[PDB]
């Protein structure tokens, strides 16, 4: 609506789900989509296909704003890391740079006990 035409895409990748959001330079979100929110459900459907579907849905929702150039941030690992990137690039978007902003701790807090399976 505001026709800013410039924004940044935040991607949060997790072993169980992936989240894609679009915001402006001031951090104000405009639209978002998730793999679980795009018809898929369960970890057995957490493949990069669901991630790209969610990215396409987010792009369709945010197309009303007329964004053309996006700076994309990657948060954490996950199958839907590059799939979301290509999905949003294919939806008429001009990529600028890929920034990895995964929150790596400097051994501050003790990690939860690892699984025994």
């Amino acid at each position: 609506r505001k026709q800013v035409s410039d924004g940044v895409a935040h991607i949060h990748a997790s072993f169980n789900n992936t989240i894609v959001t679009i915001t402006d330079r001031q951090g104000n979100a405009l639209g978002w989509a998730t793999a679980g929110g795009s018809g898929f459900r369960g970890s057995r459907k957490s493949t990069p296909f669901a991630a790209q579907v969610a990215a396409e849905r987010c792009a369709d929702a945010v197309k009303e704003y007329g964004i053309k150039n996006l700076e994309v941030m990657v948060k954490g690992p996950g199958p839907g890391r590059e799939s979301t990137i290509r999905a949003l690039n294919a939806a008429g978007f001009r990529i600028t740079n890929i920034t990895d902003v995964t929150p790596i701790p400097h051994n501050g807090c003790r990690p939860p006990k690892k699984r025994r399976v």
Partner: peptide, 18 residues
Amino acid sequence: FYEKPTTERKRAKASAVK
């Protein structure tokens, strides 16, 4: 434990380097 994996990784010190 959060310490056993570190010891296991350090056990491989003598795998093929020395």
